[PDB]
Amino acid sequence: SGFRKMAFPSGKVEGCMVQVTCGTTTLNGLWLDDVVYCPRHVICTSEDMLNPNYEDLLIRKSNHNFLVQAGNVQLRVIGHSMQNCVLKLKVDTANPKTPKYKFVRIQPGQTFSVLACYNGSPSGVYQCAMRPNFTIKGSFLNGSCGSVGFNIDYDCVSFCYMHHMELPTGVHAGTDLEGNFYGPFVDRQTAQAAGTDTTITVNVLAWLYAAVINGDRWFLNRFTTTLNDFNLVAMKYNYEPLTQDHVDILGPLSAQTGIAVLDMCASLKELLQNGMNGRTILGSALLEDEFTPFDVVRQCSGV
Amino acid sequence: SGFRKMAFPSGKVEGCMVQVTCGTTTLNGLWLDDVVYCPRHVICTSEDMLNPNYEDLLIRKSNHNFLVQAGNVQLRVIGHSMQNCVLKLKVDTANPKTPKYKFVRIQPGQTFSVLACYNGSPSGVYQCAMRPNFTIKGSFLNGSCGSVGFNIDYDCVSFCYMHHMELPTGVHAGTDLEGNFYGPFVDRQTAQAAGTDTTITVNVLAWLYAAVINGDRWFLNRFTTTLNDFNLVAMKYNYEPLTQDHVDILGPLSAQTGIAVLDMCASLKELLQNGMNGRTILGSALLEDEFTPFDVVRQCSGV
Ligand SMILES: *C(=O)[C@H](C[C@@H]1CCNC1=O)NC(=O)[C@H](CC1CCCCC1)NC(=O)c1cc2ccccc2[nH]1
Numbered sequence: 001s002g003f004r005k006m007a008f009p010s011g012k013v014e015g016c017m018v019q020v021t022c023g024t025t026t027l028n029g030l031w032l033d034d035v036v037y038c039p040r041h042v043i044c045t046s047e048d049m050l051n052p053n054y055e056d057l058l059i060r061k062s063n064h065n066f067l068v069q070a071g072n073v074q075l076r077v078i079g080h081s082m083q084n085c086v087l088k089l090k091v092d093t094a095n096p097k098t099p100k101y102k103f104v105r106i107q108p109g110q111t112f113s114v115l116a117c118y119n120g121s122p123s124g125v126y127q128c129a130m131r132p133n134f135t136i137k138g139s140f141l142n143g144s145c146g147s148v149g150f151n152i153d154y155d156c157v158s159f160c161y162m163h164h165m166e167l168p169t170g171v172h173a174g175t176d177l178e179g180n181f182y183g184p185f186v187d188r189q190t191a192q193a194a195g196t197d198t199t200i201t202v203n204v205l206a207w208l209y210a211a212v213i214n215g216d217r218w219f220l221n222r223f224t225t226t227l228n229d230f231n232l233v234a235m236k237y238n239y240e241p242l243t244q245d246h247v248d249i250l251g252p253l254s255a256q257t258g259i260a261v262l263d264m265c266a267s268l269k270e271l272l273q274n275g276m277n278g279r280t281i282l283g284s285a286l287l288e289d290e291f292t293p294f295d296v297v298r299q300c301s302g303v
Numbered sequence: 304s305g306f307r308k309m310a311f312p313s314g315k316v317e318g319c320m321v322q323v324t325c326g327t328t329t330l331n332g333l334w335l336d337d338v339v340y341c342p343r344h345v346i347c348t349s350e351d352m353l354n355p356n357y358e359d360l361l362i363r364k365s366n367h368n369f370l371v372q373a374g375n376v377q378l379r380v381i382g383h384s385m386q387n388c389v390l391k392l393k394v395d396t397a398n399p400k401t402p403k404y405k406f407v408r409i410q411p412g413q414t415f416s417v418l419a420c421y422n423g424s425p426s427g428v429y430q431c432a433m434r435p436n437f438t439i440k441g442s443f444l445n446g447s448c449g450s451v452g453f454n455i456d457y458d459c460v461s462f463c464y465m466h467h468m469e470l471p472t473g474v475h476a477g478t479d480l481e482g483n484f485y486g487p488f489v490d491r492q493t494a495q496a497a498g499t500d501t502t503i504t505v506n507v508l509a510w511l512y513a514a515v516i517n518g519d520r521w522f523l524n525r526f527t528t529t530l531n532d533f534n535l536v537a538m539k540y541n542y543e544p545l546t547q548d549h550v551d552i553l554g555p556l557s558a559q560t561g562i563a564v565l566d567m568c569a570s571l572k573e574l575l576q577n578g579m580n581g582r583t584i585l586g587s588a589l590l591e592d593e594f595t596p597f598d599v600v601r602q603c604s605g606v
């Protein structure tokens with residue numbers, strides 16, 4: 001038993017990471033096949049950081065300035081190209097450790113593993129979620145850009161996020177591996193705000209089901225509620241409105257435990273209005289919303 | 304910025320994991336060089352689980368029953384041997400992906416990464432700490448035994464823990480890679496208790512320093528305290544007594560922030576006696592004790 005924040009094994013991604021340098025700037029890139037992907041903001045210098053014209057910055061630039069290193073090994077950049085907010089540096093040697101992979105766009109509420117890298121080398125791996133405001137709550141320092149988020153299905157590595165910047169509130173923003181940013185954000189040194197910090201209700205409910213699977217059941221009430229009565233209260237606590245589709249996703253968890261979805265909703269209604277009272281749930285004193293229904297089932301039953 | 308539970312990259316360990324089967328029982332093993340290490344409890348059958356005599360169980364056993372599989376590949380067991388509570392199955396083919404590694408015994412309070420595996424295949428990676436009661440607070444299901452905990456220093460993988468069992472309170476117990484258990488625990492289906500759940504004060508203090516490095520400073524008081532006054536209060540909250548050696552380990556964190564150790568102690572004294580008040584620190588509503596001083600420095604500054 002037990003339940004913890006669990007990331008996917010980082011081995012398949014570790015061999016795909018490289019250091020990219022374009023003059024003074026140094027960050028990380030993804031070497032899949034003969035291409036190295038990295039944030040286009042590599043080509044920006046102190047002078048042109050507020051409102052950069054990347055087109056113009058590249059019309060001055062050549063694929064001779066960009067330096068890539070796979071370890072103390074160096075690959076040869078042979079042909080660059082900007083795609084949205086990503087750079088695609090064609091290299092001479094194809095990555096021998098390129099895994100079965102696919103690029104996918106995740107939606108708000110979904111979770112992914114992040115491999116934090118600096119200078120091309122891995123620092124660590126952690127579980128993350130795409131917040132409703134399209135930011136992610138991560139741990140990234142300078143030199144972290146280029147680091148990737150991913151999910152692993154069987155043999156396929158599904159790349160979904162590349163780190164680009166930190167917003168003023170300490171949250172982080174980035175793009176998918178095709179160069180399109182998540183949310184309204186953009187790669188310029190403007191002050192872009194995150195918005196309201198909404199809680200993912202379907203995730204909280206799933207983590208409550210994990211609690212019950214793991215023996216924690218003090219929060220369970222004999223009460224029940226309606227979709228609507230719940231949403232009328234949850235909305236003042238900045239909770240994501242629950243829908244009929246979320247109820248269905250919770251279908252399997254409701255039956256494995258015997259606890260109806262609207263029953264948990266009533267139990268959550270009371271934790272929100274009356275609190276936790278210093279009591280703990282799965283070692284947490286707050287309502288965790290970074291577990292998807294599918295994260296619960298995999299950790300509580302199999303690989 | 305940010306601060307999250309971060310594990311070490313799992314790549315170096317993933318290639319060392321194998322499935323071990325001895326009749327009906329199936330678990331995981333570690334294939335380092337030409338040896339495969341696994342818990343000796345592999346040789347136990349329903350009948351002999353309460354008080355097993357492993358010596359006698361082996362005098363009946365042969366290295367022809369034990370089946371190891373590296374993926375859908377099968378290695379050949381050529382010579383077994385029991386070492387403490389571990390089995391050492393000599394195999395014909397040496398692991399080509401065997402990394403620079405060393406076996407080390409960690410002490411209470413120190414942290415390590417766990418790679419949860421089932422049937423030889425990785426499920427996920429998470430950060431753990433050796434609790435004061437010599438148990439670890441993990442997520443392990445049936446078929447998880449053999450999974451390893453580790454720390455990575457530069458190029459060396461330091462293996463420190465192999466999973467063996469779950470105590471009645473949901474906590475987990477295991478040995479080091481030489482076969483010696485952590486704590487008083489033993490490999491038999493007896494009810495062994497964990498003891499008091501002590502909080503690692505030096506770790507909590509370190510996580511408070513992380514909070515201040517990351518902008519959270521509401522808990523900071525203008526008060527100060529003495530070692531002793533602190534320990535006289537912390538002892539009723541089942542906190543590990545702080546010592547002069549812990550104060551020195553906190554030396555670097557105290558200076559990077561400007562906040563003296565006994566100042567944090569006073570700030571912690573008030574959080575323990577007066578509470579958190581629903582306020583959050585680094586997204587947590589409880590006092591986290593799974594970060595060592597050295598975990599703070601690495602995540603907040605470099606690889
Ligand atoms: C890349 O490695 C870093 C990662 C940051 C550093 C702190 N933690 C992180 O997540 N990214 C940056 O430093 C970007 C680089 C810019 C280059 C020009 C185009 C826009 C991105 N900068 C920011 O993340 C940035 C700029 C800025 C301005 C005002 C408030 C916040 C802010 N953040």
Ligand SMILES: *C(=O)[C@H](C[C@@H]1CCNC1=O)NC(=O)[C@H](CC1CCCCC1)NC(=O)c1cc2ccccc2[nH]1
Binds near residue numbers: 444448475489
């Ligand atoms: C191995 O894969 C499992 C891992 C456990 C299953 C639940 N979560 C885990 O961490 N280990 C076991 O099932 C052990 C096997 C025994 C074989 C004979 C020698 C002792 C270990 N059993 C236990 O962990 C066990 C037995 C027991 C009896 C009473 C209370 C708790 C308890 N736990």
